[PDB]
Design a protein around this nucleic acid. Structure first.
Lengths: 229, 102
RNA sequence: CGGAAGGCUCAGUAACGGGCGAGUAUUUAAUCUCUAGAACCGGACAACCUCAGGAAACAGAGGGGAAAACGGAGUAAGAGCAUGUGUUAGCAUGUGAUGAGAACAACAGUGCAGGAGAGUAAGAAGCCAUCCCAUCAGUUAGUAAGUAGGGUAAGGGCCUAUUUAGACGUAGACGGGUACGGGGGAUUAGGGUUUGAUUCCGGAGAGGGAGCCUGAGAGACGGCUACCAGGUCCAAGG
RNA sequence: GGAGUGUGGAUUAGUACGAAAGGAAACCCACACGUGACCUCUGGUGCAGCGGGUGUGCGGAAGUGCAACUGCCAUGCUACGUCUCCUCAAGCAUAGCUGGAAGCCUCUAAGCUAGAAAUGAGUCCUGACUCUGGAAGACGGCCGGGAAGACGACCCGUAGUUAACAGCGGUGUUGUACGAUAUGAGCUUUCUAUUGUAGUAGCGAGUAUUUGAGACACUGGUUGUUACCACCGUCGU
RNA sequence: UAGAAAGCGACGCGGCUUUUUGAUUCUUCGAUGUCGGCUCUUCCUAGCAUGGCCAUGCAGCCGUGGCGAAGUGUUGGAUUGU
RNA sequence: CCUCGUCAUUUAAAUGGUGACGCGCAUGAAUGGAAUGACGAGAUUCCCACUGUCCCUACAUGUAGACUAGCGAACCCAUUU
RNA sequence: GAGCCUCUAGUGGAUGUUUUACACAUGUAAGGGAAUUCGGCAAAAUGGAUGCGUAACUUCGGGAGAAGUAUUGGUUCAAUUG
């Protein structure tokens, strides 16, 4: 049996083999259970872990809401874990899955360490990493730009963030400089187009409203002439 | 060591006692004793047999999975943790921004 | 945005299966004409990154991140009901469930929200014509009708409750056997007798039966689900 | 007196042997029939114990008789359950060794070796006549029990972890007591004060709470209370 | 298949058994309950299986003729009173 | 009689049952012959349901029986077994 | 005026012991279902009322309750014999 450990403060991962006695002490648990590291290893006292998921040795996934030690077949839609539909909308299919309760069937258990405390777990504690992408949306970007509850042109914040990258990362360089872009804030091309729609409605009104009066000048007896079919 | 959990009663079964009954539907099922197997055959609903663990859970006399209403532990706000920007500098920028905003 | 068309066959069906008229008691993405739009906020899913399962087919954890994708806020709009007035649109008044919305590029354009009328396609209907056996004479009880309600896009025993006994038959009912139906084909002085799987139109099916999600539109099978009859690969667990 | 008997699978092996086709030979493991025991498990049985309904009795409810029906089930008994079953010695038929008669030969005339699910012993059941030991008292009845039992007989106890009743612990069987209170498909509109207001109800199968409740047993655990120290006979010094 | 005698053995001749049916009338007619089945025990050997051996027309497999041996086995059914 | 006649059907298997056949030891017409209905505590064969009849027996109840108080016989008998 | 239960009126003795085996009257039984036996002998199963649905043959009266199937308690209502 493998054990796969994630440390979400650091963004780091490690896999280990268990021994028999360690394994046998996990039996009976389920996803979203917790335990103390001392039950897996000597030391590791007070490290609290939470169980995330895993896999049958046949390869079927453990599902978070099927509380049994057995395999079932379920009918699954899009948005259900264990199924990945592609080429037709409204497709639903029947697949084998395993319940959440841990036993000798399982090949791998996934686990999250909540807090490393004073301990020095190799690989988990020795590295710190960030994200992969950058906040495109304006208000998400602003919070990261350190500001809150004040008004700027986007250019200001793009300048701040770029300069800080040049300074803090490279101390000067053309490296970094990912292609920062901003959504949900009005640029000048938008100011013009958003003015134009106001021009349209104002004329369409007057033109429509004119013809009504122009008609009534000529046809006082509109209704009595028209209605006699 | 246990043999398993009885299907009808809900009772855990000691090693070396009880029996499995296998139906033509292809299912295998474990019973504590002849008493509860017979009650199944005669279509007595388990929730009405008041000494069963099943009945006691259903009535709410015994705490069970349905009572739990569990929810994910809520955390707090952090000093804006964002790529590159060191945690400590944001602790400073946020303050400086708040000043300027006033 | 399309995969609901076209292609193949004639098993089932004596019937909305076929010919002629009519346009409703109905729904319709695209397309046309007229008209026609001041709106804020939030998370995820897939791919990406780090581990990593399974014999394969096929899947996991953890963390970012978009939309003209999605969910909420206000706001226009707004079904039904009731009374006036104009059949009947419309308008007035009272009451209100519900409740949104796309821009982008300049090679100089392409899109998307609402209405009203067209246009295309279905659903349901009117009339008339349809094979053999009497060694098959009585058949039917949602059957025939009425009142009221549910259901549907919509009329209706379509379905249900209480009342009335009807409906159809020797001018062949009911049962059984047999059949894709026309435009047409072969023979022919005339009157006839025989055939139509088969370039066009319309119907039904996808091994046999039954259920279904998505969509403007399928009871779809080069979509899904279960049984019955048969098969294929395996490391025997799928 | 007597007890274990047989079958199959795997391996030798697709081997020896045969032209080919075909095709053998210990040890180990599974089973059947027979024998002797045993209840931990699983069936069966329901005497003790807990529940339910039908007809009719004790004014109603509660507790219950009679006719009998019915769900569960301690201890016990049982098989459809579980455990059980080989080793020496003398030697049959035979095949051999040495060897005369009969200078050669020869299992036999003397002598010797290998030898059967058969025979005789041991392990297994019954137990004749015996043998070794203690002590002036011993033993039987009467009283109370069972692991024993037709009656006798056997195993045991009598001032004590003795018996019986209660607490308080422990281990089971049944299935949620009586009485209150609340609800209940529906059906109904009664009373007091007094002129008009206020007061103001009945009848009802069942279901939920109090309540894994109440009932019943056993305890070689522990506390309290109560009862029991006799008597008669026989043989001996 | 050669060849009396692996296995057979004509035509004749000598025995044993009492499990078949006869033959005879010794015992019982002032009474010995008469066929078959069911149940249960013991004995015999002229040996069907199981153990040890000898011959072969015994390659092997399957057999056939003989010797000492009676310990343990020899069943469930259909028609019929059998 | 021969005889458990031959052929078909019923069963895994039929000295049985039913259907056929007929030189019938020794069938047969009021010494009454032949084909049916309704009704038999009449004789016979098969199927469905059902079961301690059986495989293969086990447990439990009442009444007798064993032991004890009161009461109290008979059959049979050459008897030494 | 069946069986079962009660009112009026009438009624009873060979003693004590928890009492083996074999009996005689009775209950219940896993899996199998006539294998039992001359033979289903004995036992089990079916059972009242209401409705649906009912064959061969027949002297036309019958067969016929053919066979085969479903319903049934308590309470509170409607409707008046359905």
């Amino acid at each position: 049996m493998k054990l796969n450990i994630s440390y979400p403060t650091n963004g780091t991962h490690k896999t280990f083999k268990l021994d028999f006695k360690a394994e046998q002490r996990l039996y009976g648990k389920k996803t979203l259970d917790t335990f103390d590291g001392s039950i897996i290893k000597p030391e590791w006292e007070g490290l609290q872990f939470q169980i995330t998921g895993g896999s049958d040795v046949q390869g079927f996934p453990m599902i978070k809401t099927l509380l049994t030690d057995k395999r079932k077949k379920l009918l699954l839609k899009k948005g259900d874990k264990g199924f990945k539909p592609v080429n037709r909308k409204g497709l639903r299919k029947r697949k084998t899955v395993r319940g959440s309760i841990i036993a000798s069937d399982i090949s791998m258990v996934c686990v999250s360490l909540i807090d490393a405390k004073e301990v020095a777990i190799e690989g988990l504690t020795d590295v710190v990493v960030g994200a992969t992408h950058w906040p495109k949306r304006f208000n998400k970007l602003k919070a990261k730009a350190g500001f809150s509850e004040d008004a700027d042109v986007t250019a200001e914040q793009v300048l701040k963030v770029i300069k800080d990258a040049i300074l803090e990362v490279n101390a000067g360089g053309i490296k970094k400089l990912p292609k920062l872009k901003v959504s949900r804030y009005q640029t000048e091309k938008q100011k013009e187009r958003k003015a134009e729609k106001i021009k349209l409605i104002e004329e369409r009104k007057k033109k429509s409203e004119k013809e009504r009066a122009d008609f009534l000048k000529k046809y006082p007896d509109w209704q009595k002439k028209f209605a006699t079919k | 060591f246990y043999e398993g959990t009885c299907v009808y009663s809900g009772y855990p079964v000691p090693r070396g006692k009880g029996t499995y009954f296998v139906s033509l539907d292809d299912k295998s099922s474990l019973f504590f004793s002849s008493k509860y197997k017979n009650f199944s055959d005669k279509k007595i609903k388990a929730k009405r047999v008041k000494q069963t663990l099943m009945s006691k859970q259903f009535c709410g006399k015994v705490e069970s999975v349905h009572t739990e209403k569990k929810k994910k532990i809520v955390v707090q706000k952090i000093v804006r943790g964002f790529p590159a920007l060191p945690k400590d500098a944001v602790e400073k920028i946020r303050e400086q921004n708040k000043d300027y905003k006033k």
